[PDB]
Symmetry: C3
Subunit: 287 residues, 3 copies
């Protein structure tokens, strides 16, 4: 009977959602192997939410090895229609400061080595990622931030997230180049997660937590190393207040998302043309 | 006795060449496994042409999983000296409109996960891709287009094709970025096909069929979804007329291509230095 | 008892270091398989240096298949604290001419298919690559060049190296694009080598040998093909004089490098949290 309309995918610094009631863990098997950790289900004011720690318990996974296809497939099997990804990012812009949040509206996928589709091997589909972060969810995030009355920082909307492979932080020349491409924040995880969520017909948007300037800033002075985890911990607690507010808005407003029908004019291979093995592997994504 | 000097690699919307006479299919085994489909051989005015459907019958393959090395190796075994790749593309430029054709002269390889050389594991070679689309074949395509007297659209030469991994269409920020890199059209398939054709000493050029603006255009209005396959079908039939004319010109003119000797000053490992296994795998490419 | 504080990783045209005395070869097993070739140990004026031919004997490896993790791991096991990578590059800038040397201070990793970290599968670490080429070693290289009194060319410092996957040389549009990103030289090998050296806490810098303009120059005239190996051979012999001088300076000056402590605030997984298998695989990199 385990079902949730709304999921939170928690990034660096988010290993649990403390405030959920009647917490219970579910191990979901998928055709893509195991998700990053058992998915936690609980209620935030009677609204059932699924919480998935992207890096697993103890932060055991690097961005490149996160099982993105299992995680999105598992959330699909729970009936999730809305995902909020909560991710630590570096800032590429002077006006986006540590402890600010950013709700990007665009993304550029610079990742190299990640499987970034559920398709292939028997089924062809080409979803549009023109608007890769659902504006109805992004608008909710903006009002959720304001509703949370956060003491530190501000929230910026309409930014571009560039996703890199990792795990190392960027060289200065790479940071300069991402700036020239008009990117605003940098992270390692929201691709291929945004692509996969779209293929799975799930509305997906990102609440980014600015943890520092990328390296385009000479952090050289002895005043940089340990504050950086402490601000990651402060960001994470601010993020929890924002999520509380956002879950409330999604539950009451239930916005229509273009993601919800993304597969239907993108699927090239008719379901009747798929092999038994292909249909079985794609079962939760197909109408 | 199955030999062809000229091959057409057909993209989205091109699953056959109807006009060829004495059609016959050949299954070619290669050291890279099977090509995308049986290669069809037939005569266009007594000129033997090989036709290969890049996506296989029924459009079964996504761009990332096309067996590019098998396809080019197989066409090499038939003695093909000239390839025309016929590919559906998105436009990144206002003046390149749906139903136009584009004959690019440059390419940028943004693909991530494709094996993009026949070399490695026993043999080292570094071919130049400075001019990655043979200008002698591109010039033939331009005159072929004019000779075909196409009713809809115009043909543009001297454009840059950016090849992305796919399968999803680009985000708006990615489209903006490709524009800033001076790319003109976007597709998913002509890399590594152009690199492999060059390593195989085969002259290779692209006839691109504009199927729509990339996403940098708000197709939002209900007036976009189904016309998009119908214009892909119109493009494909216009393309057939162009190919008819181009095969005629290549057959009569037999232009000299720099691709024809591309391997000879690029090969670092002397053939006498290769292992038996390496020589056998590379046999059709070596002098 | 085989130990060296300093290693030279030799690129195209560098298959040995002739001047070392009491040469002896060591085969090092690593958890990442075998290095590119047996590492040669010898003394340059009584200073022990390790010499590793990146492409193996006979130039047998392409850039994509070099075992970068084995090579860096093996040099770590010898106690190497300083690496000079000596690499052939193409120039993207008019003022960087064939036979010049370039000591870059920045790098952009455009490679696609290379394992670019020792981390994952049990251990998470995020080293900063903000300054990816140790300025203390780069400054030594500059003074080493001057000390070597090279007859042909000049040496340029403070350049950006863009690393591409290879093996083909760049299209003109790609060369144009790398110019627009403010890159100065192009090579195929120093990523992921620079990332891995940083994770291994080894100071790493590059002596780049300009072997020609990239393709952004019409080498068309019959005056280009064979001079290109002869200038690669002249570069290589100039490089040996520079290395002689650089080894001397590193040995006497022993500069402190930020690389030397790069792992200590970057490691996320506590050593006590790693599995036996993970600790064993990472043993030489861990404190
Ligand atoms: C030389 C520039 N300095 C070094 C002292 C830094 C320092 C930290 C980062 C971080 C970062 C990551 C985790 C915790 C704190 C930080 C921080 O900054 O202070 C980053 C954290 C994320 C990030 N995004 C880039 C992929 C990925 C999330 C970029 C980051 O860049 C940093 C640069
Ligand atoms: C290799 C990458 N190229 C870039 C254009 C593509 C992209 C899309 C298609 C589509 C297609 C594209 C967008 C949305 C829906 C479809 C679809 O398919 O429904 C197609 C849709 C139908 C189709 N035919 C298969 C024979 C239908 C007769 C072929 C299609 O080919 C495509 C090729
Ligand atoms: C939001 C922007 N709109 C959505 C309604 C579109 C719509 C379609 C495409 C297509 C496309 C692909 C197959 C059939 C028709 C189309 C079309 O456009 O109408 C494309 C087809 C190819 C293409 N190249 C990009 C890789 C690959 C061929 C890009 C395309 O971009 C499209 C954007
Ligand atoms: C790792 C990537 N780097 C970028 C410069 C390269 C690139 C090319 C070569 C070549 C080379 C380059 C272009 C055309 C022909 C050759 C060739 O090789 O014939 C070489 C050609 C000969 C050669 N020697 C092998 C010991 C010949 C003595 C070494 C070569 O090394 C190259 C390295
Ligand atoms: C059309 C442009 N012309 C063709 C005649 C060339 C010619 C050579 C290169 C070389 C190159 C590589 C090995 C030996 C000599 C050369 C050379 O140039 O003359 C290169 C050698 C390295 C290089 N870096 C690019 C990856 C890699 C080392 C780029 C190179 O670009 C070249 C372009
Ligand atoms: C997925 C990519 N994102 C980009 C910011 C990152 C990047 C870094 C961290 C770090 C981190 C970052 C930089 C330097 C040291 C660390 C560290 O870790 O010591 C972390 C350091 C500690 C940590 N906590 C694990 C639960 C400590 C409580 C989490 C960290 O998460 C990171 C995430
Ligand atoms: Cl932790
Ligand atoms: Cl920092
Ligand atoms: Cl179809
Ligand atoms: Cl459309
Ligand atoms: Cl050689
Ligand atoms: Cl040359």
């Amino acid at each position: 009977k385990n079902a949730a309309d709304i999921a939170i995918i928690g990034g660096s610094g988010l290993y649990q959602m403390q405030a959920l009631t009647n917490k219970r863990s579910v191990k979901i098997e998928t055709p893509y192997g195991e998700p990053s950790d058992d998915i936690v289900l609980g209620e935030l004011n009677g609204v059932t939410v699924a919480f998935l720690t992207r890096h697993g318990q103890g932060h055991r996974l690097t961005p490149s090895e996160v099982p993105y296809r299992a995680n999105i497939y598992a959330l699909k099997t729970l009936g999730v229609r809305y995902i909020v990804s909560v991710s630590a990012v570096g800032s590429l812009q002077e006006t986006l400061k540590p402890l600010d949040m950013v709700i990007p509206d665009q993304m550029i996928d610079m990742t190299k080595q990640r499987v970034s589709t559920f398709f292939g091997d028997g089924a062809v589909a080409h979803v549009s990622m023109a608007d890769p972060l659902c504006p109805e969810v992004a608008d909710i995030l903006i009002r959720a931030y304001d509703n949370a009355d956060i003491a530190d920082g501000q929230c910026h909307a309409k930014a571009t997230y560039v996703c890199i492979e990792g795990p190392q932080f960027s060289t200065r020349a790479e940071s300069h180049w991402y700036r020239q491409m008009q990117a605003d924040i940098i992270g390692m995880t929201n691709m291929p997660e945004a692509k996969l969520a779209r293929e799975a017909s799930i509305a997906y948007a990102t609440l980014a937590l600015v943890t520092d300037f990328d390296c385009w800033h000479p952090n050289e002075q002895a005043v940089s190393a340990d504050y950086a985890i402490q601000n990651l911990m402060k960001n994470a607690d601010n993020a929890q207040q924002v999520i509380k507010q956002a879950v409330a808005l999604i539950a009451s407003e239930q916005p229509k998302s273009i993601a919800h029908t993304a597969l239907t004019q993108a699927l090239v291979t008719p379901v009747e043309a798929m092999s038994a093995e292909t249909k079985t592997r794609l079962a939760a994504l197909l109408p």
